Amino acid sequence: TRSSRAGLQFPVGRVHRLLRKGNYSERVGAGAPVYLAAVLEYLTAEILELAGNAARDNKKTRIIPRHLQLAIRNDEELNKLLGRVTIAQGGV
Amino acid sequence: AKTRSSRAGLQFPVGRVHRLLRKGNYSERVGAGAPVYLAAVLEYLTAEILELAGNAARDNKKTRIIPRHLQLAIRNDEELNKLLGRVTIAQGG
Amino acid sequence: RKESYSIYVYKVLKQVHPDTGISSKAMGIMNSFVNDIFERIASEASRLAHYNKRSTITSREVQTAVRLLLPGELAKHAVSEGTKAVTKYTSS
Amino acid sequence: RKESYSIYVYKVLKQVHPDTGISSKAMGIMNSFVNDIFERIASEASRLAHYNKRSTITSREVQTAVRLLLPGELAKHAVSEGTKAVTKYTSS
Amino acid sequence: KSSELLIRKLPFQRLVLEIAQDFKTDLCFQSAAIGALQEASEAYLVGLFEDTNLCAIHAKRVTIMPKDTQLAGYICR
Amino acid sequence: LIRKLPFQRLVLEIAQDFKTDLCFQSAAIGALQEASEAYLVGLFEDTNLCAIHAKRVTIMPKDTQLAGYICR
Amino acid sequence: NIQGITKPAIRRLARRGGVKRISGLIYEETRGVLKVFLENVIRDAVTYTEHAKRKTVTAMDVVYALKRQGRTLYGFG
Amino acid sequence: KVLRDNIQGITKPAIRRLARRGGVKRISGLIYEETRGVLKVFLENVIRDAVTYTEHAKRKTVTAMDVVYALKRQGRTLYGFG
DNA sequence: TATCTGACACGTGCCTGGAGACTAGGGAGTAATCCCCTTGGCGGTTAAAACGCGGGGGACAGCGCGTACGTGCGTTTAAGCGGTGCTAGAGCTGTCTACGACCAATTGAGCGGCCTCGGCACCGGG
DNA sequence: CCCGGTGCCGAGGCCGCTCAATTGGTCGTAGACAGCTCTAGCACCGCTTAAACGCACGTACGCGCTGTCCCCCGCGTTTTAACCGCCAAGGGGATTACTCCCTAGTCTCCAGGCACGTGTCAGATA
């Protein structure tokens, strides 16, 4: 696959298919799906790391929406990204 | 009529709008009547705002429509202002 | 050569007010406004066609984009003007 | 047959936290987050490509979109990760 | 500290359905549609009340009064 | 409402911290100036509203802080 | 109708907001603003539903409506 | 060359005039520093975005279109510089 | 009262982009089937809403003070304007080449159905 | 305010099918690069004068202080209707198959809109 070639856990074939079928440009390079998949994986890993840390600070062994919103709102960069976003079951 | 803008009886270009909807990465297929509809809508909006701006300029015994009259025509109208509530009219006072 | 909407805006002006002019700065403002409204309606129609798995932009996506983007009476009159123009186009 | 990022998010989670599970509602929220971020980056890069008359979305458009859409340290680490993935991919 | 829903499910469903009958008479709503609407409404009201409390504290008061809600709505727009 | 030369100098000062090498078209300076003027005028409108809500007539920095906090 | 949004519900929404003391004229304001917010969101959702020539409003219609108003909602699609 | 302290070039009467246009009648003496800081933050954000746009285009000149796009990305659409 | 002086406004050249005509190929329209999810109605319990009373806490008004703001006026600074002058630098253009789309064959990642056990709510004694 | 006994339903893993992604290859065209010319941003000068600054002074009003009272929160008791569970019915969403006409694509033709040049209406000048 191309994920293994790039060393990622997010699909590069699917991201390429989505950048192509999404009417974003007349043609898509071979390095755009890889870069975008890497960025998506990094952001997902950051959110999951912080949410699991919040769950550890709450003696729970499952990430639930409350932990996701604790991870998001307690980070200034990460909350500036998602300020206009509400979360189901997220609370305050 | 040869010109599509005249066949529909408009003043905005239907051919240019068709080309823009074709080269704008909105879809891989554009219908025949979509440019006509869009050009008619744009023409109606432009005519409305120009009418209000000219009426404002005639209320000040002026002949030409300057940015200030456009700002007055936009802000003094409810719906039009609601359409452009985050728009800064340069030199519009 | 660089295109614009100057000629058509002036023609619409000469219909609405036969004996008034328009300053060049106001002309640039009107051109920017036309570009902005075109982009708004086109983006909304593209998302409408993407959501319904459709490949083409018919007059029904453009009408719905107008219906969503414009306030009540403004949308009502824009829809009427578009319907009239489309009917006149197809009838010939 | 419905596309989703659940398996990749699970792989990332079991990488960062091998002992932490994740609720189904948290998977839905993370799946919405991934789709949202992918769409925002792709749209911003499409605008970057169009504004310069280019027809191709390269890695340079995605990098600029990331630099514009994410706050400072988040953007820095995302750019580093994306460059690393692209280099590892093209080095093979 | 909690993360539940604060309005009752059936009054909110009735209100949403009654509003919808003005816009188009013949519609069904999915159960997830009502859930999404209720979640968004609760979040919007909570944010409005936070801004209202900030306005009240600014006005040298402790209680919130309607004038706080118009100020918050006007600033946020 | 703001003198052109001080505003251009401030813009160049701010821009030197992002790329050392830049120059700015006069139209770019004009666009920045008009955007800044509009932004500050709107900020002062919301500050005055907050001040009147206080029962004051004099605007104070707390009024500006509330007008910036609520506006997000 | 709108009076199913009881006073205790508005108190619970206000106390999750942080409000300490509530005036008696607040509840009518809250009902009004809830009605307006729901009106806008439901109108957009009904437009989206009728464009697809459907007759049930789905959770995705409400999500697209909210995102059109700028109220992006996670957890429903 | 390098530039210093030009934010203090936004004199007391300029801020007062902006306030008068906004509708403010009486201005506390601590308002001026607050407004200078606010304007500095706003300009810093906008210039950062415009510089990014210019840098991607492989140029050395920030144009009016770059600033217009930077303002639009912030949600502050500007008319009159197409 | 002559004149002269810019931003609108109109007269030519043309070239390029829009139009007329025709194919070919598939996106979309529409009949038909299936069933999943909605609607509605009913019954119990019990949690939450509603009403009612008492007080004290906070809202609102008046007053008093002293502080800092507006106005004025003379001085001082530097913005604005004309003029020169240059050189980076954006844009146009001419090539050619490498990179992306398409298509054919193959296969393995991923998705749906299914199944067993662990993480979390409850509790009543610790 | 903790602890082991009971307990339960969705989370995590398994297995087979399938179609979307990978492999090798050619075609074509977008853009990377080198060259060149014309513009406009930037630096510096001399002069005018309009805005900015610095002090003085009255006074408008912001802050605190006290007093009055009203109405919101706590609490208790009564009512009601929300919610869980069941059941009966259907209708509209999702999919599948057959056809057609509408749009991309191509080619030729030509007109219309963009540039450049010059005339002209509010307004101050000799």
Residue numbers in the entry:
A (entry chain C): 16 to 107
B (entry chain G): 14 to 106
C (entry chain H), D (entry chain D): 33 to 124
E (entry chain E): 56 to 132
F (entry chain A): 61 to 132
G (entry chain F): 25 to 101
H (entry chain B): 20 to 101
Question: What does the publication say?
Answer:
Histone H3mm18 is a non-allelic H3 variant expressed in skeletal muscle and brain in mice. H3mm18 contains 12 amino acid differences, at positions 13, 40, 53, 58, 72, 83, 124, 128, 129, 131, 132 and 134, as compared to H3.3. H3mm18 formed a nucleosome core particle (NCP) with histones H2A, H2B, H4, and the 145 bp Widom 601 DNA. We determined the structures of the nucleosome core particle (NCP) containing H3mm18 by cryo-electron microscopy, which revealed that the entry/exit DNA regions are drastically disordered in the H3mm18 NCP.
We determined the H3mm18 NCP structure at 3.4 Å resolution without crosslinking. Intriguingly, the EM density of the H3mm18 αN helix was ambiguous, suggesting that the αN helix region is unstable in the H3mm18 NCP. In H3mm18, the neutral Cys40, Leu72 and Cys83 residues replace these basic Arg residues, and may reduce the histone-DNA contacts at these sites. Similarly, the asymmetric DNA detachment is also obvious in the H3mm18 NCPs. Interestingly, the N-terminal regions of H3mm18 were flexibly disordered in the H3mm18 NCP. This suggests that the interaction between the H3mm18 N-terminal domain and the H2A C-terminal domain may be weakened in the H3mm18 NCP, and thus may enhance the DNA end flexibility.
